[PDB]
Symmetry: D2
Subunit: 330 residues, 4 copies
């Protein structure tokens, strides 16, 4: 079965670049605009820059490195011709069909599996790769959430802290690049904070990411919450976790546990560095979570860990990983 | 007749602030959001900061310094009850009804005059205060345009150059803050350059402002064109005019003519400074066009003149001026 | 005694604006540049905009609303003739004389008191207004630190939490506007993080501000630390405090304690809001610490509190308050 | 002769990356900081991102892919040990030795050639590659200037216009990313405009780049001037040239002449595109000047041409080209 993308946006386009680079063929791309515009946005990217290959188009297809990909502008997911293009797995990256009752419309068009690139409601399962991907059951799990970028940044760290030390409870903040949910200048929005000019403000906004970590690490249920602060950067984020552990530790012990995890069982998901880096250094990093070791603090059993993540590229790599897992399992 | 605003956006809200400060009663504000949100946006502004007064609201009204203003969320302009609010002049600042055939819908609800806060299609006349406001005729002109921010920046300077020296031809660029037409991150847009992340790019885009200037100053027909470059600032712009004149001049002579106009016949429209200023210094300046004298260059008959403008506040002051003209004329 | 300023920078100039508005006479301003430049920088400010008054200069003086202020460019503080200008209290805001042994150079020129506008080493006392200003002893305390902007944001909140609930320990992060210590583009710096382009990065950096809060609240000694994240905003910051308290609390109780303190004993120092604000809304706020009530979280005895602060204007208001206290006490 | 770099800054480091990729050996790098910092700044770049190879250091050397490069911190050019490292060609990229009298100090350290990466005074020749590099005479030209980034953007376009149509005179503006000469927040500067916060302003500033174009195209002497507007982008610029030609032309003819030159005699120096691009699309482009064809305008004999350039990477490629020319000539 082939792969399809609904919503060729920031996440959809990076997921495409990654799948394409891995040889996983996407057969249909659907959005709301014409193919000239889809091609143009793929070709030129303000963050990741020129597509490393050839991009062309006509009224029916995008042509990427000589490969024809059907490309359409069908607003209602029930009407997307997935079956005709041979698509069995749909990446749902529009942002408007995160309710499973709406995302299931892709099955009417002949899809077998939908991966929602966001927190969902009513999904069969939420997966964070490296943390609970072994819980995926291909016979029962058809509408699947890959969680949020922030949850993917948190869960690997929290898994390590729980397994090495035990976690009584924790709170976090993510200091996070702006995204297309926000506003360029002050403008009506359902969230009166996100209404405000994004590139000249620090903007507090509610996040379900810490609560949602309990979906993949049930030990955190009812004892993990947090906040987001959106700041004037275009991609790249950092999670600042303050945890109360079940024993007293040093910063060095916390770092050693995270390093061991990054080099071993969580390799490719969790990364670890002791370099004095900044945001631009993690742009286009494929990891979910990049521990910045020099920032770790400990006051007995109370610790502070920082983990960077490129909220576009890192997360998109996880969507691609999940697509490959779903394909592997049938 | 009372005044009404359709589109309580960046321009609509600043025009409201200005009219309120002048004692001009706005009796109805219409947008697409609830009154909590309208009140919030008025109260807290990322550029002009806290509204100088009390703002409150309920389901039917905004309350500003005690005074009740009907506040609604009616998507179709034909259905706004301007008549019941006593509104005769509508400020059309949504950005989606710049075609006079659509803006005329306000007359169905009982308005007598519509001021479109943008370049228009099919309007009765386009007015630039200080340049052709005497052409406004209340017996002929009912749907009128106040032109663009850029046209209002250019026309006062071009008037002076034409009258003092004569203009053979001219080209211009405006280096211009981003606006809400643009995108925060790369996203589909009808204009493939405006599709791109606004706060991390210089973005070329087409402008009709020079051609529009050549109509309010008709002697320049076919002799004036230009371009815009959108850059990462939140408000404030500068026009860079290169003109071939009908004789040799000096920079000093050009500056003297502009200063004379600013101090006399174009006072309140054209300003003049010799200070070494930058963008932040012209934020909330009420002028249409602010000549930066130290930037003026001349090579014989070829000159270069720079004029700043706050594309929100300055333009909003001109809308308010046009509103007061229209009210005065009946 | 009259007041002098050494270092007419971001803090020095705002302190001047504030003292001038309060009628406190500044008799000498010293920097490294000429009076034309000092006058220009006071007149035009990229954040606080046009100085509300007339500014002029000559080779020996700045003139503010017609009042002459001696203005010089003397690099060695031992050579500034404070006593000749009648100056007894020096505001030391250069950033390079925060070691008390260096700040004492002002005493050679006849000053009696030096207020270092930063954390210091070897000072007689560090004061945070509203927290320990009553500890000031005019007979013995001559070299005084007003602490950092961040310490001033933290100490009022920590005082309230200790007094209402008891604080076992705490960690914090400040998400903080860039400052002139940082680099516009990647450039050598003693801090490899601060070496990096400030306006296109989130930049972690060490802060002593939580540890230094123990200077004014000794109960926190060995029990409070944190981190800074510098982000692309030009002024305005927020402190994110995670505290372990001595009993279980609700977010409502934490907010009520902070509101009571803001409305009572800490009025003018600590503020409290329930509005959904963003950074631009706290620019030019005079408070040290502005609790954002809707962001408060509690999980049993672990709480999370956010306090905004304008790192320039708020802090400058505290410097001015301390200046007035020192003058009052003799 | 081997190559040396004095001033391992924005230009110095990119020139290093480019020479390294070309297999041109750099044998000494001098700056004002320690080798840890030089290695760190090479390794991690906020624009061009991770150095594509291994970087290490000790007290005496940097190591790039295992190759040892002497690395020192000698403030006085006369004292740099160029002779011991076998260096015959010094890239002078500190910004403080653009006067040939000071730059000549490298020759008494054993160097034979100095390429000043900026406009110079007293130099033996100023070269813009593609325009007058054939004038380089190795027997007489010791101290060589590679001109400014802006001059390199202008001269290729002006050469084409003169040769195809004839140029009577011209004026230009460059809309230009901020650079390390500028200030992060308002701070004293010799240039009162450049004193101002760079990332929240449009900042007009003088440029000698159009006048300096006459050094390589003498027909433009006294007939070409312009201005710069510094805007909040971290690299990437665009030149906006308004030229009066010696006959009437269309935009199509102008574009055809620029395309022919880009595809033929000026290949690798001048590029030509008809794509609808923005600043991020030209970051890390190696060309001096990239014509944006869709922006070209003509009114009779008055034309307007826009040419993009990465002021770091493009210019650094020209420094590398000139180094290779100087090496080839002996
Ligand atoms: N950007 C991030 O950092 C990030 C990270 C992880 C997850 N996500 C989630 O991924 C989803 C997409 O986010 P994004 O940032 O890529 O958004 P985006 O706004 O950049 O892209 C959304 C795309 O969906 C298209 N679209 C909207 N409605 C459609 C419809 N009915 N049919 C087809 N196409 C439609 C839009 O035209 C646009 O191209 C959201 O759920 C978001 O929460 C975003
Ligand atoms: N921002 C500037 O610099 C500037 C300057 C001069 C002119 N203008 C023009 O003014 C107009 C408004 O621009 P803006 O920047 O304020 O835009 P904006 O996007 O900030 O505001 C538009 C407002 O219109 C509302 N709206 C949209 N559709 C509506 C509808 N059908 N009914 C009622 N309300 C609706 C939106 O909710 C929003 O609040 C545009 O035509 C723009 O081109 C803008
Ligand atoms: N900016 C903030 O947010 C902030 C807040 C609280 C405290 N502070 C502290 O206040 C001090 C100043 O900070 P700033 O942001 O105003 O810095 P700044 O760089 O804006 O200003 C420093 C001023 O001192 C002048 N100066 C330097 N050396 C001098 C000397 N030898 N003699 C006279 N003048 C000299 C400089 O020319 C400049 O005008 C620092 O200690 C800083 O840590 C800053
Ligand atoms: N950045 C651009 O866009 C650009 C483009 C073309 C030319 N230039 C020119 O290249 C030169 C460097 O510009 P930049 O942007 O790389 O500047 P930069 O400030 O980034 O780098 C300058 C480097 O020189 C070092 N330095 C200063 N004095 C020194 C000394 N005495 N000895 C050794 N090293 C010293 C500094 O430590 C720094 O690392 C300037 O002349 C500039 O005008 C810059």
């Amino acid at each position: 079965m082939k792969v399809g993308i609904n919503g060729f946006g920031r996440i959809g386009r990076q997921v495409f670049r990654i799948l394409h680079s891995r040889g996983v063929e996407v057969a249909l791309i659907n959005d709301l605009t014409d193919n000239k515009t889809l091609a143009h946005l793929l070709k030129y990217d303000s963050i990741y820059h020129r597509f490393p290959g050839e991009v062309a188009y006509d009224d029916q297809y995008l042509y990427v490195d000589g490969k024809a990909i059907r490309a359409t502008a069908v607003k209602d997911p029930k009407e997307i011709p997935w079956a005709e293009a041979g698509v069995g797995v749909v990446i749902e990256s529009t942002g408007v069909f995160t309710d499973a009752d709406k995302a299931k419309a892709h099955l009417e068009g002949g899809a077998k599996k939908v991966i929602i690139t966001a927190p969902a409601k009513g999904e069969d399962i939420t997966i964070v790769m490296g943390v609970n991907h072994e819980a995926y059951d291909p016979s029962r799990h058809h509408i699947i959430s890959n969680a949020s970028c922030t949850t993917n940044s948190l869960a690997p760290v929290m898994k390590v802290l729980e397994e090495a030390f035990g976690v009584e409870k924790a709170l976090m903040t993510t200091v996070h690049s702006y995204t297309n949910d926000q506003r360029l200048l002050d403008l009506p929005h359902k969230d009166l904070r996100r209404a405000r000019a994004a590139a000249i403000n620090i903007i507090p906004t509610t996040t379900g990411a810490a609560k949602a970590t309990a979906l993949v690490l049930p030990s955190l249920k009812g004892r993990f919450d947090g906040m987001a602060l959106r700041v004037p950067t275009a991609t790249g984020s950092i999670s600042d976790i303050t945890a109360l552990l079940k024993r007293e530790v040093t910063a060095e012990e916390v770092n050693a546990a995270l390093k061991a995890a990054a080099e071993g069982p969580l390799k490719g998901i969790l990364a670890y560095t002791e370099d004095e880096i900044v945001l631009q250094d993690i742009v286009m990093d494929p990891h979910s979570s990049i521990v910045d070791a020099k920032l770790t603090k400990a006051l007995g059993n109370m610790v502070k860990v920082f983990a960077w993540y490129d909220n576009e590229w890192g997360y998109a790599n996880r969507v691609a990983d999940l697509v490959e897992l779903v394909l592997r399992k049938g």
